[PDB]
Amino acid sequence: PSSINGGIVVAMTGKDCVAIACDLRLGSKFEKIFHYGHVFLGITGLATDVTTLNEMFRYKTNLYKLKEERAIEPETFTQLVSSSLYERRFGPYFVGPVVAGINSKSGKPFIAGFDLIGCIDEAKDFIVSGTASDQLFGMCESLYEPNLEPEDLFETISQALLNAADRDLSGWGAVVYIIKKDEVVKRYLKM
Amino acid sequence: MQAIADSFSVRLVKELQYDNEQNLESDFVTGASQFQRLAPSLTVPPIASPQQFLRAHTDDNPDCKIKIAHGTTTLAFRFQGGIIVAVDSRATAGNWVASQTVKKVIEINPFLLGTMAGGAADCQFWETWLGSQCRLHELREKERISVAAASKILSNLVYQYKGAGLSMGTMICGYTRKEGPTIYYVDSDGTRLKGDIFCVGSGQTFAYGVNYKWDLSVEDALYLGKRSILAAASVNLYHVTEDGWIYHGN
Amino acid sequence: DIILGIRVQDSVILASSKAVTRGISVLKDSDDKTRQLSPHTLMSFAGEAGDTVQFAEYIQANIQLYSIREDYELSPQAVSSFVRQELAKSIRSRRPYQVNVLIGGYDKKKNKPELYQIDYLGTKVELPYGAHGYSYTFFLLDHHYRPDMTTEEGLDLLKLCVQELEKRMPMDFKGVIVKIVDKDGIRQVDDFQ
Amino acid sequence: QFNPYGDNGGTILGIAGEDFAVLAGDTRNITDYSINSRYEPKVFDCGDNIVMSANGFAADGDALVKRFKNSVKWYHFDHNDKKLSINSAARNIQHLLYGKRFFPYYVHTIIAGLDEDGKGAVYSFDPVGSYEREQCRAGGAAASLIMPFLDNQVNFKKPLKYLSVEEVIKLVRDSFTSATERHIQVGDGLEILIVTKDGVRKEFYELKRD
Amino acid sequence: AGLSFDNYQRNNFLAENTTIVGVKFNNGVVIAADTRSTQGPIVADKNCAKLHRISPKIWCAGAGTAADTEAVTQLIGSNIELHSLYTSREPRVVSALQMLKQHLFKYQGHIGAYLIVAGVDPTGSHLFSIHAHGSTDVGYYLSLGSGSLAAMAVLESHWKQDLTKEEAIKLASDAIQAGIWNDLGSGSNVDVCVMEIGKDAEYLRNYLT
Amino acid sequence: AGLSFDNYQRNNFLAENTTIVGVKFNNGVVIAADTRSTQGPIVADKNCAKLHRISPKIWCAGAGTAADTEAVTQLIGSNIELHSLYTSREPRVVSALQMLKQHLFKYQGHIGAYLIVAGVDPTGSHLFSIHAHGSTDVGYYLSLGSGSLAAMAVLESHWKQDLTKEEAIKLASDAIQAGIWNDLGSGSNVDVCVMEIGKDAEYLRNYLT
Amino acid sequence: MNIVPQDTFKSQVSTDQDKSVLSSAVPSLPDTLRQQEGGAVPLSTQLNDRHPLESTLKNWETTQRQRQMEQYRQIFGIAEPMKRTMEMEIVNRTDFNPLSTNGSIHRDILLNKECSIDWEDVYPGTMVGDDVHSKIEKQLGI
Amino acid sequence: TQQPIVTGTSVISMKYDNGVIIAADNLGSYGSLLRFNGVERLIPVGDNTVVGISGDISDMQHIERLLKDLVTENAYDNPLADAEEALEPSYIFEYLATVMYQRRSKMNPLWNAIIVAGVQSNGDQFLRYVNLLGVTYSSPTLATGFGAHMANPLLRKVVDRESDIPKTTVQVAEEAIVNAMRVLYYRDARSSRNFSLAIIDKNTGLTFKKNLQVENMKWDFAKD
Amino acid sequence: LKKGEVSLGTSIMAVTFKDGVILGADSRTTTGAYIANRVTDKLTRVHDKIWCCRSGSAADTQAIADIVQYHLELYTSQYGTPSTETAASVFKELCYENKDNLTAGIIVAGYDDKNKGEVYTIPLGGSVHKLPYAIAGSGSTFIYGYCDKNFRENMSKEETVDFIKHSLSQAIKWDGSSGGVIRMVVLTAAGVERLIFYPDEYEQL
Amino acid sequence: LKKGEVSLGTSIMAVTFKDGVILGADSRTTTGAYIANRVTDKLTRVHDKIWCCRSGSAADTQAIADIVQYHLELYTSQYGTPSTETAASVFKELCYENKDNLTAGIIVAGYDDKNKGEVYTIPLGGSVHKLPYAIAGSGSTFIYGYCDKNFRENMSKEETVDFIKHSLSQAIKWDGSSGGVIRMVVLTAAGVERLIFYPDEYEQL
């Protein structure tokens, strides 16, 4: 009940949309995906570090909005996450973060991943984080196709998560976010 | 005397290490005697610490790790109708597709069953060898071997190699006219324990809730074994009588 | 594994815990840590895995061979000396293994009970009472032991020791099997410790 | 202390059809980040319509294959040129592997052929002899990528039972091309051996060489 | 202040329980790299830009800890920009080399960045190699990375004093191509940057595809 | 047969839980030693004979493991006596040296005996040093033990080619006395043995005190 | 031309390696009762934790003899080692004293050890099977 | 064995249209000391085989003894020991690889890397590699040690696939080998300027060149 | 000393002669067995007629040399041209005070109007020694005898050049960490003269 | 290699000249820093005109030399005087076959009517090399250059004596494990000649 360390996060890009999904332990509240207006961050690894990073980034994004008088964009948030991670060069957090979003002014989808000290991996297709399943990357590679519609993208990412769950069982669930320029949809998967 | 002369008459064969009969047999130079040994020959590294060498080189990237048997719950118990053996059949997943159902119970002969735990290869190899030994014994004595004798043979075998690296835990179950039904547990530490009820693997405490009496019918015993496995958690069921083992499946 | 033994005026009482292996749940009604060496000499053993059982069965086979060959029974002293020699021999070329044996017998030539204890290095000591496996029962034995105690008083002292042991152990300690060796042979106390 | 083991990472894949079997492997032989060779086959015809591959430390696999072929020669000599069945070959290989229980070969072994009824059969071995018959198995560095591709393409989606040889060859080629695109240790070439009632046929395809 | 040492003991307790070349030619310098980015044996990105800009005419490419390389390059670039504004002069490669050397020596090798730095300034063209512990060296042609041996073999095969811009570009591209073919760490594409005296820097993304 | 290896594993499991000089003179050789025998810092015996007799005219004195020294000396003495009976000739120091060297080399240094061997035979006078691993050396004057440095200093101070018997005896006595005074391992008395060509060996017990 | 003995470690093991004490009930397994080693000595324990000098001491004389034979073969020819080995085999083969363990005089003469003593000479050294008949069976191979 | 003491660096080799070429330097190093100059590391076996050995020098001399004994035993009572019963490169390689693997399995290895080059009796080129672990492989270009990291990229630009073999003349292959040796002398600290080369051709037989020196060295740009 | 750090396996010589001093070195920098740079310049200038060569850790010696050059510029701003002894003292203080954290050895060659050419050696540890000539590096061990048999006081410039060339050629011949070209600086009252000799010249000596 | 074992930190030279061969050595045996024997004779005779010097473990080399002398006596009983090549081959076989248990290196100098003086070196490991001259020991490292600059083929006896004396004097000067007197054996067709030189003579060279 108190063991929540680990998990997986999958981010994918479609046509004018993005998808970010994470696993969840259900059965008989702790989600690894957070948002800061229109930028979504999913963190895998040590749970205490995940909570710490979420609190710190909420702090920094609130101050940023108060000062700039506008919401932060995915690229700026990516750079902020990188610098914050690098601050702890010799005591780094045991985390793997993934960022997804849509730029407001341009409308371009954006996804990125980070290492534990902030090295940025900007991918045009998809990002997989976590070590729960080694075949999850292969399944995502076999299922992904460029320029998918939001319904097709949701189906693809949901199928990837379902197959990964079947690979490794009771109480498993998923949370999926489909993000457009002006609409965000959050769905739960109990399969 | 001329054999001595040949021994002192001449390099290449010495470097090939083929002047030793064991090396020639192992490489099938002089025939197939290597596949004709009742007691298998096991290679060891010619160093001062073979055990440390093996332990270091086994506890470390590709798929070339030694396969470990399922830690799933297995139950065996005895009643007036024979023996009930129940195994939680939930095969693991990997980079392969199974052609048929994977058996976690080794059929030593049409009258003996064994259970796998620890090293899968050790259990399979040594239980097949035990089946060969039992067949030879039955041919010699013109009578079915007792469960105690077979369990003792396996225990002595594993004790001769104790500490080398073998890892196995098995339950030998059999029904003979003289002994009735009998269950022994034998592990790689040399322990040989006769018993009435055995629960091995994860969830053994839950499965040990066996409602147990020596008057249960066959159907009642099968249902009790199935329920115990479900409480521990499909279930594979075996009913061992004097005429052999019968596989039910559930 | 814990073993206890008390030599009372006319007999020897040996108590062995009916424990099982760890990690496997077992149901049985047998004393697996005791071998009858001769109709008037019993041996209880404790220690590690099957090495101890192999040693005990080897000793039993040798003693049975002697009894068949001579049509005669070795005295408890000679049996204990042979066991000590074999235990010393078994570790002359290998790493020693944990083993501790209590040998209780009734000598009919002298018509008296005898009790011996041999540790893992092969040290034989003749004692009025002994134990192994306990982390104190020694003080309880010292205060409540007399050389001329009867079998009943020895059983009462054994029951007190068993209660003292069980007051600091979990319920996983099922119980202790008790056997008595005297002039009529070896018998099992099916009633209680 | 001298370390007698090495690693020459490659990828192999065995698939059993309705009345055929296929065993494929990449031909890249590498040491660390260097390329020892770009065409070094690892799948061999052992006679009696049996194909074998032992992926991992190359010297151990070569020794195992050599020993098995010599044993097959003696089996033909001693039993009136009787054909060795696939299950008997699997048993022989299990004994050969377990003979090194305390000094094991550092390989993963796959054999393929036709069973007594003519159906395709594939056997997979652990390093110390534990073996099982399987419909499909991938081994090596890129197995975790090849297996999802086949699982998405095939159902064990047209069923595997009704696939032809050409379709299976195409599936293997596509999976290996994807793995070559994703894995640094996979590339250069791919060699496939097909076992049918007429015998063993070899096919070769090129892969990316970077 | 500075890089934090918090959670060092906690992390210890938890634990207890590329081809890059630089070539000089008669009127400038060229730097080149491959575009394969991997995370272990997995190819993470087939088109990754490894050539970084310290200043408009001073470029570099690194190996080792990627985050350290990027962070050190950016910090030195900020220092160079501030110094150029302060002195109202074009930055010099020697100044960037001095800053990098002293910064790396301060951390006693704990910042795992190994760099090739090329540049053009009013004093001329310059090419340097920088080690993590703070040692620096000068050269006419340099290689770095896991594919540096093959690239260095190619460079030693076809290097001479009188090299034109086109010959230098071809030589650097060939060295990167050799690292691409013969090293598992490289393989996708070739990125080039040419810095010529008296002209703007020319950044050729995917010069060879 | 031979020295036993039984209880080696058992002992491992349980564990887991002097000044000697030799001096040559113009017509023979002299060997000398101190008489203090200690068991750690405690003086066990103030009068201990450390000069041993391999043969009537071949003597030796040892250091290291005392039991090993005594056992090896006695074994070589038995071999020498048997060989002399077999050949019907006086034993030679070279033969004893050969036997000792080969025996010590057979055991690969596990027999901790370090010896000075002096003797007279029909070929002349001989003095040798023998190491535990099997190496041997020849010399005109030798020292051994914890007090060997002081004794060697005295020997280097007052040694010359033309030494009479009395001068050699005095020099050996002075060396042993220096080891007695300046080393905590020595101190009680001086034992001497003089072997002269053509005469019987002379064993002087407690020559000084 | 070896000096220190080499190739002393065993390369293969089996439960029937000691042919003289094989069980009659299970011929693939050893007979622990007739082994008379204490009853708790698996063969695997003999493969580890040995004193490093034991193998050198046990095979020293054989190694020196083999080096001498090799030198004779190199310098004199095949016939000289052939004759030495033949003489030694003839002497060792016809000596059968079940009540004694000391070597023969002729063997010592052949080995040039007439007036030589080693610790093997000083220290030359049950319920079951230590009688004359066991030695007869081992000698005759029946 | 279990430690190298005196060693040689690298051997390089390639196939051309009508034969094979192999080369190796003449240095035996003693750590950082360049102790022995004049060590021949190409061993000609028969009229059609050359064996190049890198690594431990004492083990290399042991292998030379084994090869000479193999030639002598093949000759023996064979009348046509040089006409039709001469040793083939494949036979020599099979024996050497068997020895290497057997001594690896004994934990008593020979610390060497071996390349066998030659021409079979049917005119086919033979070029194969074995090492101390018993690992064997074949390729149109082969090299050991530092050469494997620097000579192979240069040689693969001339012969990159099998189809390139018929297009490569002896002159081009020899020039490539010489340039690779020069590069190795530039960038290997345990290398020597003196080297030996061997050409095995199905028409002209065996040509063994000794006392070859690296020439045309560009030590001119160091002035500034 | 530090793990994974660049070392200086060089061949260094400094010889005093009648008109001044000459400092010579090879040009090889290696990482294990691989030659990282075959044309490196090892003659470090800390003042117009005060030069040095370095051994040990490359980073530590470079930092020390930079600090020494800065110190000598500060000194020159006050009192003019410093003496070789002053530079040697600064080098010695920097090496000795940091010997527990830095691994550095320095050979200093200087010329001035008063002392007319001097050589100082500061080996590992930080002690200082003034000598008529000095050798250092991994390749120096092989030429200890030869130099001792061929050095004379008050040699001419050409004789000193030949002596250094022969000694460094032998050092290159026997040391695997040394090679390339031979670079020399001649410091006299006339000025500073740089010389270079190529392998095809000194290998035929 | 063995713990607490006597090592051979010597200076060994062997030079072939016009009339034969000369073998030379120092006379120092040390245990760590203490000099155990300052007049030891290191020139080992295995046959009347076949001599050797040893390095590595003293016990192992002594055992090997004794076995070689016995082997050469056996050979002489059959075929007469052996050649230097045969003795070198026996030394090499003994060293190589036991290289996992013994640490031994041997320099062999011989004369015979056929080959007229030869030198062989067998370093650690067991390989064999035939050379016009050879040096070995801890003190040899300091005279690698000097010898390379001063050896000529077909020198006279006096020139060879001077060359060996100078080289060994330098080796003694720079090596702490070498010292004492210089001992030489001259092997020609005329016979065997023993020579000794004292420190007060060679220290003034």
From Swiss-Prot, chain A:
Q: Where is this cross-link: Glycyl lysine isopeptide (Lys-Gly) (interchain with G-Cter in ubiquitin)?
A: K60
Phosphoserine PTM sites in chain numbering: S28
Q: Name one GO molecular function term.
A: endopeptidase activator activity
| Phosphoprotein is among the record's keywords | yes
Q: Keyword set for this entry?
A: Cytoplasm, Isopeptide bond, Nucleus, Phosphoprotein, Proteasome, Ubl conjugation
Question: Which is a GO BP term held by this UniProt record?
Answer: proteasomal ubiquitin-independent protein catabolic process
PANTHER family, per database record: METALLOPROTEASE TLDD, PROTEASOME SUBUNIT BETA TYPE-3
Family, per the entry?
Belongs to the peptidase T1B family.
What name does UniProt use for this protein?
Proteasome subunit beta type-3
> What gene makes this protein?
PUP3
Curated annotation (Swiss-Prot), chain D:
Spell out the PROSITE patterns in the cross-references: PROTEASOME_BETA_1, PROTEASOME_BETA_2
Which GO CC terms are listed, alphabetically? cytosol; nucleus; proteasome complex; proteasome core complex, beta-subunit complex
UniProt cross-references to InterPro entries, sorted A to Z: Ntn_hydrolases_N, Proteasome_bsu_CS, Proteasome_sua/b, Proteasome_suB-type
Highest taxon of the lineage: Eukaryota
Read off the PANTHER family from this record.
Answer: METALLOPROTEASE TLDD, PROTEASOME SUBUNIT BETA TYPE-1
Record family assignment: Belongs to the peptidase T1B family.
Q: What is this protein called?
A: Proteasome subunit beta type-6
> Which species?
Saccharomyces cerevisiae (strain ATCC 204508 / S288c) (Baker's yeast)
Curated annotation (Swiss-Prot), chains E, F:
What family, per the record?
Belongs to the peptidase T1B family.
Protein name (record) = Proteasome subunit beta type-2
Q: What is its EC number?
A: 3.4.25.1
A GO CC term attached to the entry? nucleus
Q: Share what the entry says about its subunit structure, partners included.
A: The 26S proteasome consists of a 20S proteasome core and two 19S regulatory subunits. The 20S proteasome core is composed of 28 subunits that are arranged in four stacked rings, resulting in a barrel-shaped structure. The two end rings are each formed by seven alpha subunits, and the two central rings are each formed by seven beta subunits. The catalytic chamber with the active sites is on the inside of the barrel.
**Mind listing the UniProt keywords for this protein, alphabetically?**
Cytoplasm, Hydrolase, Nucleus, Protease, Proteasome, Threonine protease, Zymogen
Its annotated compartments are:
Cytoplasm; Nucleus
Q: What does this protein do?
A: The proteasome degrades poly-ubiquitinated proteins in the cytoplasm and in the nucleus. It is essential for the regulated turnover of proteins and for the removal of misfolded proteins. The proteasome is a multicatalytic proteinase complex that is characterized by its ability to cleave peptides with Arg, Phe, Tyr, Leu, and Glu adjacent to the leaving group at neutral or slightly basic pH. It has an ATP-dependent proteolytic activity.
Catalytic center residues: T18 (nucleophile)
Q: Which reaction does it catalyse?
A: Cleavage of peptide bonds with very broad specificity
Keyword Nucleus (UniProt): yes
Its primary localisation, in coarse terms, equals cytoplasm
Name the enzyme's class.
hydrolase
GO BP term, example: proteasomal ubiquitin-independent protein catabolic process
Gene Ontology molecular functions:
endopeptidase activity; threonine-type endopeptidase activity
Q: Which gene encodes it?
A: PUP1
UniProtKB/Swiss-Prot annotation, chain G:
Region annotated Disordered, chain positions? 1-35
Compositional bias, Polar residues, is annotated for 8-26
Keyword annotations of the record: Chaperone
Cystine crosslinks: none
GO terms, biological process: DNA damage response; proteasome assembly; ubiquitin-dependent protein catabolic process
Post-translational modification summary for this protein:
Seems to be degraded by the proteasome upon its formation.
Q: Which GO terms describe its cellular component?
A: cytoplasm; nucleus
Q: Which protein family is named in the record? A: Belongs to the POMP/UMP1 family.
Function description: Short-lived chaperone present in the precursor form of the 20S proteasome and absent in the mature complex. Required for the correct assembly and enzymatic activation of the proteasome. Also prevents premature processing of the PRE2 propeptide.
Q: What else is known?
A: Present with 2740 molecules/cell in log phase SD medium.
Record protein name field: Proteasome maturation factor UMP1
Originating species: Saccharomyces cerevisiae (strain ATCC 204508 / S288c) (Baker's yeast)
The organism's taxonomy opens as:
Eukaryota, Fungi, Dikarya, Ascomycota, Saccharomycotina
